[PDB]
Design a protein around this ligand. Sequence first.
Ligand SMILES: O=C(COc1cccc(N2CCC(C(=O)O)CC2)c1)NC1CCCCC1
Ligand SMILES: [Cl-]
Length: 293
Amino acid sequence: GPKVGRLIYTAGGYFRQSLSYLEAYNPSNGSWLRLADLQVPRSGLAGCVVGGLLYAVGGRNNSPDGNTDSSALDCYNPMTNQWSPCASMSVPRNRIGVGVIDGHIYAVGGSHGCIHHSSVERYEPERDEWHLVAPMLTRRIGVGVAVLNRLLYAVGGFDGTNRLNSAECYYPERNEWRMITPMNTIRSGAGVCVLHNCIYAAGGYDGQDQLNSVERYDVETETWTFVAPMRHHRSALGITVHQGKIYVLGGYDGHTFLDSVECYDPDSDTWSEVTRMTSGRSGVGVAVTMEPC
Ligand SMILES: O=C(COc1cccc(N2CCC(C(=O)O)CC2)c1)NC1CCCCC1
Ligand SMILES: [Cl-]
């Protein structure tokens, strides 16, 4: 089916305060477009796409005048270059993870003030409704989430006391979570995505440093294996997959809010630096959909 005309969208983020930017990168020509701002600036949000619409989920608006954790779900239509509110979640979720299974959005974990959630809820676009599902076995904020073979994975994060190397899997037809093999590295605020038969965890903070290492979980063999490291150490990086490659966007390296975007080729096991965002930032949401009109 059609593959051309897709862009990598980055929404929100953090640099000095939370940001409202929506910008889209075209890998086929290197261009960036600035599109309609989010209604509310947010960092620590997640992006995903269902039915060609881009959704921005959760986060927090940090500003000089305070911090407000977000329960929002907002949907951006590339055909109109407009955002519309959707039904809000049961609870604010900053530093959230999301995944999509069969047209439904799962919102996982995140914080609300000092509350570190284990709760999980599922959005039905056809009905514009959220409903809670079974909670995780561990409270997780800064959690990485990805979907492979219609199973939902929650990887790493911070439980309110410790940063985590643990990970777990949600089996929808049983409404049940089970632990999987833990990662080799503690990772809070890693980029987590799916490519081929593996769940990749790139970067993050281990409690001591921002990481450039990357490891992948083979869902058949249940092992975690390191791949080539990124050029940059990064925590709170954006991540997505497009045409068989992983793209990582921004993050914090311990010194700078990065503007660089790196791309991982699994065939050569190498990372290359492919572009730069218009400004450095961390805590963005990222997803792929059609270019706007
Ligand atoms: O960009 C943001 C806000 O969005 C996110 C999004 C995803 C994860 C995180 N955290 C990173 C550190 C982790 C940890 O410390 O364990 C906990 C999770 C933050 N916040 C910035 C981060 C860089 C420093 C300045 C604030
Ligand atoms: Cl998605």
